[PDB]
Design a protein around this ligand. Structure first.
Ligand SMILES: [Zn+2]
Length: 617
């Protein structure tokens, strides 16, 4: 357990910022605190959770780097930074003193990667660990907090994903905070987000147990325009050659599909072929390997590449000052996504120009709507999922393998079940993220009892060289194997069925089964290998739910979950309509009128619309 670095003064007020923090701040490279950074850093150094909403992505890294540096100087500890896979996909390396490491899904070394990082942690050669959310609550997960150094605090990047009001709600973020509190000892969180309304930011503060406090107006030097050209490719060439854009040398163009980035980049390179030396345009999307993305971003940072054509999803994790223009080929899916992308231009006070090309026949809004309706879960899927999660048990009425008679009725104390992910996805026609979402909906509800224990392998297969006689000979070493061989009038079975029927823990069953690779020589001990093969498979949700629900109670559960599915859909549709209405209300038929100078009345009117959207509760 890590004690707070700084202690509160009398009456509970924050202690005055010491000299040490400033020294550390200079050491990292930044020579000044951005607004709200000094207070937030002092909060974490005192053990107080805090939410920080930043207008631009710049300065987000310093908020966890300075406390991690100071927490690690006092006593060997570890700071967890949770951020999406895109953030760690390309081996990002920060300041050297921290000695950071990343464990993510993309790491294709399996336990070797995680253990090498674990072994590096054990050698104190790691003080900041960056985990994608899926790695923290996935199959591999993290070792117990006892094996790990004590955690000073956890930084939650993209904290808006916790709230059902944000543009990008991800239920696994609810699981992350739960595991960090229960499995780990983390009760001091730093929430970092760059895009959130007052309704979303206040909801995140509820989840992180942060006191509410005011903490993104679009800058005055950004000049916005919107048009509905007939041919977007032709219009893009016409706009970039106009006087408003022809002398801007740092442009980002956001596209919907990544096949489009390579086409637009190749188009600009051929139609603008000509001080004199520098590269015109390069595509930047997630399909490219890690090397080519690093080079493209490096070239853009060094002013050697004029245009980067990227997808909205990959976007630009890089922050560069004096970015001159941001263009959108297609309606953005939300105000948050637009302001984030546009907020990258004009970091210096110098003027920056942004133009959005709406699809003339409205096909971009129709595609976004088609996606929302496709992500909706059918009611039959919700009904079939509830039946699989709350199946009837024999506690209140043979059916049980080890009962010859029903026996006296009992009050159901819950059962542990394995919901196989791949099997349920193909049987119910719903993706894994939707199943996870509905399970998270049920756990949060107070009246409905469900526990999402873990995501792990629950199926076990045992192949024997000696056939059936060799497997029977090992029944004295493994009580789980003993009850299986009796039930059977290569063997595989469900390990969570064993858990519930014999009262064991899933780990205890897993240990005893893999102990089947050792045998004791009759003379002495000299444990030697049995040669049996033990393989775990069928990744599943490990649940704990009652088995005594009536049909009426299951129906009420379905109405709850389906109501949440429809309300999430009505919210996503309402966000699309409100987003299109704003850009259209300010749009021209072509980019001709804004080839020379933007319309200040129109640019100001749009910037005021966005401002009132985020200042709303
Ligand atoms: Zn029961």
């Amino acid at each position: 357990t890590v004690l707070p670095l700084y202690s509160l003064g009398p009456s509970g007020q924050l202690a005055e910022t010491p000299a040490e923090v400033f020294q550390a701040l200079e050491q990292l490279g930044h020579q000044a605190f951005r607004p709200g950074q000094e207070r937030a850093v002092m909060r974490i150094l005192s053990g107080i959770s805090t939410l920080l909403v930043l207008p631009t992505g710049a300065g987000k890294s310093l908020c966890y780097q300075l406390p991690a540096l100071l927490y690690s100087r006092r006593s060997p500890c570890l700071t967890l930074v949770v951020s999406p896979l895109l953030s760690l996909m390309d081996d990002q390396v920060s300041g050297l003193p921290p000695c950071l490491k990343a464990a993510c899904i993309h790491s294709g070394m399996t336990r070797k990667q995680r253990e090498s990082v674990l072994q590096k942690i054990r050698a104190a050669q790691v003080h900041v660990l960056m985990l994608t959310p899926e790695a923290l609550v996935g199959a591999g997960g993290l070792p117990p907090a006892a094996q790990l150094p004590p955690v000073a605090f956890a930084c939650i990047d993209e904290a808006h994903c916790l709230s059902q009001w944000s543009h990008n709600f991800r239920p696994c973020y609810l699981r992350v905070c739960k595991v960090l509190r229960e499995r780990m000892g983390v009760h001091c969180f730093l929430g970092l987000t760059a895009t959130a309304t007052r309704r979303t930011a206040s909801d995140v503060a509820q989840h992180l147990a942060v006191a509410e406090e005011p903490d993104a107006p679009v800058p005055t030097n950004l000049h916005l325009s919107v048009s509905m050209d007939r041919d977007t490719d032709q219009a893009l060439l016409t706009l970039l050659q106009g006087k408003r854009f022809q002398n801007l040398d740092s442009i980002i163009i956001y596209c919907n599909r990544r096949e489009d980035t390579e086409r637009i980049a190749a188009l600009l390179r051929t139609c603008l072929h000509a001080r004199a030396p520098k590269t015109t345009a390069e595509a930047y999307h997630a399909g490219m390997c890690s090397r080519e993305r690093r080079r493209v971003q490096r070239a853009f940072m060094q002013g050697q590449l004029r245009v980067v054509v990227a997808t909205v999803a990959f976007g630009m994790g890089l922050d560069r000052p004096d970015v001159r223009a941001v263009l959108h080929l297609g309606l953005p899916p939300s105000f948050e996504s637009y302001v984030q992308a546009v907020g990258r231009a004009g970091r210096d006070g110098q003027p920056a120009h942004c133009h959005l090309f709406l699809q003339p026949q409205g096909e971009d809004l129709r595609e976004l709507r088609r996606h929302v309706h496709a992500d909706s879960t059918d009611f039959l899927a919700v009904k079939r999922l509830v039946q699989r999660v709350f199946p009837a048990c024999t506690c209140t009425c043979e059916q049980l393998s080890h009962q010859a008679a029903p026996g006296p009725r009992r009050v159901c104390m819950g059962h542990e079940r394995a919901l196989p992910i791949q099997l349920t996805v193909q049987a119910l026609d719903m993706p894994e993220e939707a199943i996870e979402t509905l399970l998270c909906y049920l756990e949060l509800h107070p009246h409905h009892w469900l526990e999402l224990l873990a995501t792990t392998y629950t199926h076990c297969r045992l192949n024997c060289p000696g056939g059936p006689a060799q497997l029977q000979a090992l029944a004295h070493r493994c009580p789980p194997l003993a009850v299986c061989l009796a039930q059977q009038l290569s063997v595989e079975f469900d390990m969570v069925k064993l858990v519930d029927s014999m009262g064991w823990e899933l780990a205890s069953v897993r240990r005893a089964l893999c102990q089947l690779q050792w045998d004791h020589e009759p003379r002495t001990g000299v444990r030697r290998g049995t040669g049996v093969l033990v393989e775990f498979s069928e990744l599943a949700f490990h649940l704990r739910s009652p088995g005594d629900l009536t049909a009426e109670e299951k129906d009420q559960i379905c109405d709850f979950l389906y109501g949440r599915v429809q309300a999430r859909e009505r919210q996503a549709l309402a966000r699309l309509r409100r987003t299109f209405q704003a850009f259209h209300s300010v749009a021209f038929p072509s980019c001709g009128p804004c080839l020379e100078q933007q319309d200040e009345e129109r640019s100001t009117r749009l910037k005021d619309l966005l401002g009132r959207y985020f200042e709303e509760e």
